Amino acid sequence: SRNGELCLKKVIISYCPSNGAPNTRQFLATHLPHFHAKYPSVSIDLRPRLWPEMAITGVYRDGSERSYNTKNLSPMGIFLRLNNLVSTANDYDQPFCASHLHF
Amino acid sequence: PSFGRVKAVPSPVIRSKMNFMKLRRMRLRDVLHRDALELRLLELKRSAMKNXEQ
Amino acid sequence: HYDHFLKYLNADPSTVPXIAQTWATTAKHMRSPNWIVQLLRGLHKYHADAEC
Amino acid sequence: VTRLYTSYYTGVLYPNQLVQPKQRLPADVSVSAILQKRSEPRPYVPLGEVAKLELQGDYYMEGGMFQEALEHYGVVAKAYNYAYPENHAQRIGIRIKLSAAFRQTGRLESSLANIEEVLRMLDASTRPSLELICEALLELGITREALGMKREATEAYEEALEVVNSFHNWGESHRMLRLLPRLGRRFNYNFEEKFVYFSPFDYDRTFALVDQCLERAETIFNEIGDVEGAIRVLQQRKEMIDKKFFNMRDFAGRIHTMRGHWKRRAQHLTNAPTPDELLRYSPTIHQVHRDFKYELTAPIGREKEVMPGVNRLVLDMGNPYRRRGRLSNKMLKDADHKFANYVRQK
Amino acid sequence: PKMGCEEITRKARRVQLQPTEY
Amino acid sequence: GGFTMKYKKGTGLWDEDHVNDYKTNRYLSARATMRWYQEMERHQTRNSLNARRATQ
Amino acid sequence: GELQKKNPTPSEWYDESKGPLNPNFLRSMRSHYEVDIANLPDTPLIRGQREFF
Amino acid sequence: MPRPAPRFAMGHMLPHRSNVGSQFLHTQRHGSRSTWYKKHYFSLRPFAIQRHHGTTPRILLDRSLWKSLWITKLQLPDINRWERVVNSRRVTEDRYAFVEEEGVMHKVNWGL
Amino acid sequence: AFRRLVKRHKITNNQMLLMRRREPYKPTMKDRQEIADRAKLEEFERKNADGLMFVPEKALPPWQKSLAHNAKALGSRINFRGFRVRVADGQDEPGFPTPFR
Amino acid sequence: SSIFSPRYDWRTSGVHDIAPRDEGDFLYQGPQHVLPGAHPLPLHHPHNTITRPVISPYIPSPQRSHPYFTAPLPELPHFSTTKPIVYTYGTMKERIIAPVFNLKNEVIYTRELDPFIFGMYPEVEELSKNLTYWMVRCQNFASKWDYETREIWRKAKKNWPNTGMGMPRVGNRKNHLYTWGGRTKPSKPWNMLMPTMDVKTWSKSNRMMLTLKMLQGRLQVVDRLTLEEPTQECYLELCRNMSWDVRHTGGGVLFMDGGSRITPSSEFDRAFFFGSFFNGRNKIVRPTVLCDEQYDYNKTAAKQRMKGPKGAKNPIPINRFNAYDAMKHDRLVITEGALMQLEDELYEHKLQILPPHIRNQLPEYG
Amino acid sequence: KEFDEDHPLPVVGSRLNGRTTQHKWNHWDQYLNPQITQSIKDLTPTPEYVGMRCGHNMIKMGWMKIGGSWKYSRGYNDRRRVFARGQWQERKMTPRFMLAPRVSAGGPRNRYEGKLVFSPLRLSKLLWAIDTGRINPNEVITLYHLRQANVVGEREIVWPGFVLISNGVRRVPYPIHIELQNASAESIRLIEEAGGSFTCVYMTHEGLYQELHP
Amino acid sequence: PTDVAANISAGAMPPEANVAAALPVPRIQYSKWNRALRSDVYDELLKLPLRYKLHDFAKLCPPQRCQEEPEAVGVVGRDSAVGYLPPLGPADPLDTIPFFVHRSSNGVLPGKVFSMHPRNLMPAFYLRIQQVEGDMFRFEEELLKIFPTKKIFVRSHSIYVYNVALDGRMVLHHWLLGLGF
Amino acid sequence: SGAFGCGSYRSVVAGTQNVPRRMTFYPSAYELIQLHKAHREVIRHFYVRDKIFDNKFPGNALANGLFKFVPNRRENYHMRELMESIRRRSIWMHRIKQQREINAKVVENMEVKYGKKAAASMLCFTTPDSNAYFAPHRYQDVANSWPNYWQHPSVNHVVPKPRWRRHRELGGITRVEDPFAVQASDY
Ligand SMILES: [Mg+2]
Structure with a gap:
């Protein structure tokens, strides 16, 4: 979030509503309303697939993408990684050192 | 007296069972609260049914 | 005898006969005088038997 | 090696430190409506310093210095009224504490006035905290029984009970604390990790508030001579503590010492469904919505509701023997026609 | 071994169920 | 040769009883089930007929 | 025949006080009564609450 | 229960011969690998090719493997057609390809 | 014959990199051997402070109990006092007066 | 890979196309948006009453002990069990009454069930023993x-x-x-092992599985299993009339043919047995939960030319009821003859299980 | 804990909080709600079962990890291979079995042919069976009656049959007529004082088999 | 709880008590075929604070009266030398016990003692109770009241109490008999 | 022959006077169970002996009229197993009939000594926990003997009562209206 605008634009979630691996379905049932009520501007696109990719993707406003792996991962962990997506801006990757404390 | 590391026990197994007994006494406090509630309710029901029959 | 007398004094009215019998058996085991053993057996009989 | 803990020892990270949310009242139901259905039949403020002052005030109230607690509460309540907008949670909570201090000092009329103002602020609020409303009307009941309104005090305690039985979740407090005994891998030493216990009076303060409400209600009923009311309140208290214990219940995993397999804690620490939510959303009562638009299988009658395709030709059933010789292919001859007549349209 | 090895194309002694001890 | 419980072989209620069948599968198709019943009946009938022929 | 002539409407078993009924069982039992059994409202109909049919 | 059945001998693990193992543990044959598609350690898993292992398949698609190797003419009778299991059957559609058009993924005829 | 593969420990204080011995407050091997010998000797002396209490036949070790019982069951079948069997095995003589004696 | 691994989250891009397909993808409307498949509990098989319909008077509810009748209906004839009812240590301690279905998909009458058979509350360890034994046994040993x-x-x-x-x-x-x-x-093959299953554990696990099916509500009692003709089309017509999804993908059916109520038999009906051979998810099993005592006449490798796994030389036949097949097949259809046979074979077992002060009252009660 | 509602705490996960797999139904969950038992994978064995052996119990080192260090274990190799050592006690002194003499050519407690080694039968056990209802006191009790009432298992029946021992009994309340072998004098006296009768039916092997299989 | 040998050596007890110092008091041992109930153990149980009432030791002990009866009538409760009696039921009718303890086929109580790693014959033992029906957790709480310092686990089939011997089994059987099982 | 409860030839030779015995009432429940299972065993032996071939396949349909047992094995089976089972069943019947005669004598003596109702009450084997096995609906208020204890009417208050409703737009699916509770997810 910079000057009152979120750098995260879209959240791609892909899941299978019928076969197995119910972690993403649990997440969609319990934590997704909370995340949506917390961040209304972020558009979340759900993709029902037969063989879904067990991963969560975040598309930012500068055209960047960040994907986390969610294979056999708890819905709490999925929620944590989604909050990581909405928190980071995905614009740089700098170390935490004395010469890098000041941008 | 329950401040951190309450004592010096002669063995870490004694320390382990002291912590275990602390947790057991907590659980027993809760169980005894519930059981005292049940006993008081039972005595009240007994007295009430006796006074109603009489 | 002190231990067993305390047990007898603090025993439940439904467990007094068994504790008196245990006292008599303990006296017989520790080889107390025969009069002590007989007195304890008589006390046990007094507590156990209804007509005695 | 034993640890003396002489130097500064940083705490350990344990799942009991999870930030538990607050039970909120639904937006539709209102405390005003509950009371009516019962009667039917920001600027800058040094909040750190005022929090020091409020902590000192509640320390005075717990130690028994009621006038000092009252003046501390008044100062911090002025600060909160300036720092927060109308009908705020911290505002109504601090004036709850203020009414309690008034009642303890003996200004019962002002205590009742402040607690009624708390009630109207709760009614004006949108989704107030269940703990907040329970504590507010508990203070209301205690003030009423101090004034001499014992029936109204019992009514307040009973409405606490009826709110906590209808809007409070009894299993959410020990969702992440229930499978913790499965982390212990040693049986000879450090075996208290298999018997770790967390009292509900520390992780569910609404439970303790309603417990005190029911205790005071039972005391008042015993003083008045209402055996029926005393029995009712004791039954409800027993039911509440039984619900709490049941939501804390769990079976035992491995008993003895396990070496290795440290990556099992990922499975141990999870959003394990509490007994309450399990029995609530059992997959038979709370059924899973299953739309066949995104599926390749459907019931016998609803064949056309399957996911669509372009130029779909039903070849046959995938008889794994069709790859074999002519005799096997002759044996798998009429199965397709019979399957078609079996799944024909009604 | 290999699928079509000369070592297994030709026959050899075949091991049997060993007898247990007393 | 050796000792085998001939006194138990053929004593069950059906042909599949007391048969050392260790060549099966956790799922049997229609053909597999038909062949299983066929092989059980064939085992029983071959045993009986061979014994009768040898005796006669 | 005797039992069906005696009982036109379902008995106490036709209640939702503890849980929902089963449409399959209702469609199998339809032939035993005169009223429509399988037609269930969305509300958990209770015996003593509202008179059925 | 006298010596309950072993979990490792449940037929759900045919592993490489390791240092540890029971006498009743059926490991993979000598010279044979445990995973079929792992020719090398960097070999990928085939996307739609499925090798039926263990029991006989209930529904065998023409492009799946069962006691057989991959032959193009046998596993792909028509390369423009895509077979699938719809309502316990072999239903064949026109194979398609996803292409970006106007910001969305659109299905076009794969052969064309 | 000690562990050549040194045990590794999670280093929480930088002085654990310097310390070689795990428990420095614990006596050395031979010192604690001597300490254990001395403590066991003191416990044995405390146990033998009172004399050797003579024991009846039922509270005997198994390798003496039944032998001593069979050595005199014949004489015990006939109830008369003063019958003694001088069995070879049993408790040895203390050599001094004993309060239990 | 493992979650505690560096290679778990090393895929940063390329997993998802930024463009969504215009056929199935949609956006999240909000809390009131009912998402297909979403459920709070972890359900690896998220089915409902439409995909996997239950056949019982009520839908299994937590407020009900079992999804069947607890008292006989005054409009349906009630048939008690062939043997008297006794409640042992594991029984449900509550009356179980199930409707008997006619082959025209109609409820003709109702019948009491035995808690010792369908009331033995299930236990995961016993069911696991059953399943593990069945899989280790059904493995093919000649290819080892x-x-x-x-x-x-x-x-x-x-x-x-x-x-x-x-x-x-x-x-x-x-x-x-x-x-x-x-x-x-x-x-x-001779170095491999075949496990041994005792009759006690086998019967207990089978009765627990029957009780689990009854609790889930997928148990259906019919009067007969007969076909007018021994062909497959008659069997498929019967399945279509009874709404039995015997397809390879639908919820399979497990038949237990034991005959009629008046005419029970230990042999399958000939016409139905010839018609039931269909390439789908349907299996017929013997009307029994017990098993023969398993033996081993080569426990010490005396006969060296033995070709076959060590252990029991009398394993459980394939056509027997088991936890694996019960889990694989959704619905369990049982006949009244099979019910009678189960009761007759378990009567003496439960009587011997009974305690002595209750056993001494058996001739008193009759 | 949040001080104010307006300033909640961030959701920024930790390792212990995020690195968590999905929940698999356990024994308590499946026992509490049997509706979620939907697959064969739910039927898991006893939780005391960890799994297959995943390491090497290398002696004097502990449970070492596979692929770890092997340079400090040859006792583990001598444990795998049946080859053994241990002459540290034999270098000077002779073994105890070489030092001890032999009391007889057969040894102590030698079970020679026809030694009359009876399996014990508790008189308390017999009285418990009688009071329970397994054994009918109206008839003469024999080893056949015991075996049929299942008071003793066939594992215990070895020639010669049994011996009645009065362990834990000082008084028999009812008269009992029993046939056994070599009952103790005290048990015989107890039965006779109660009013019953004992008969030492010392039979041969053929007689025992005929009494057990009439 | 007096050291008889110490008192003899000090002069507080006569030297004839060496048999009492060496051997325990001769008492009928408690076994599975002989219920030799102990009045002292039952008195300790009655003095312990529990939630449910316990029957009287007189009712627990079988009726010991004159044996002048010619025919042994098959009454529910009769004289037994081994102390066998059917369950007596609850002590107070106005109560509900959350658990039910079934008896074996021979009338034995479910208390069964095992060992930790019995292959090496290790002297560490535990008790397994695997016939309790109802609220196994309430049974476990009562077991916590009985044995405060022991480790108790509970499963759907059995309840384990670790580091309790045949004496612990006897105490458990006494408590169950007093409760009414 | 000691199979019956009279005594063996060894006791006859010994001359032990065990003829006058204390007639005590004995219901013979274990013996009745054993007789039931022995009767079933005899019937099953007759069935397995009389099993004849009935093959459903043409390859095996050549011997559809014969016994599955060869005549020699059939004779041996009938001579050992069938008639040994019959003899065991007869032994059980004899023992139970003897005990029934003794019980009739005891009942007569008790009736002439005390009275009909008194003798019936003294001979009744009813235990205060017999309902827990024969009619648990009368034992519910005594103790909780349910495997699912949470559903017992005494502990039934803990089971939650959701507010379910049917949704026609979802296909008659029942769905619970209770809103979920927020879970602790970070620390
Ligand atoms: Mg020899």
């Missing part, structure tokens, strides 16, 4: 063969001296180190 070093057909002579050339020291070089050699301890 493998070559040994003494089965390689190479010259029994040292190929080259150990100190002569730069090659390593080796002799016959027919061992596992070489691609053509075999192992010292290879897999053999």
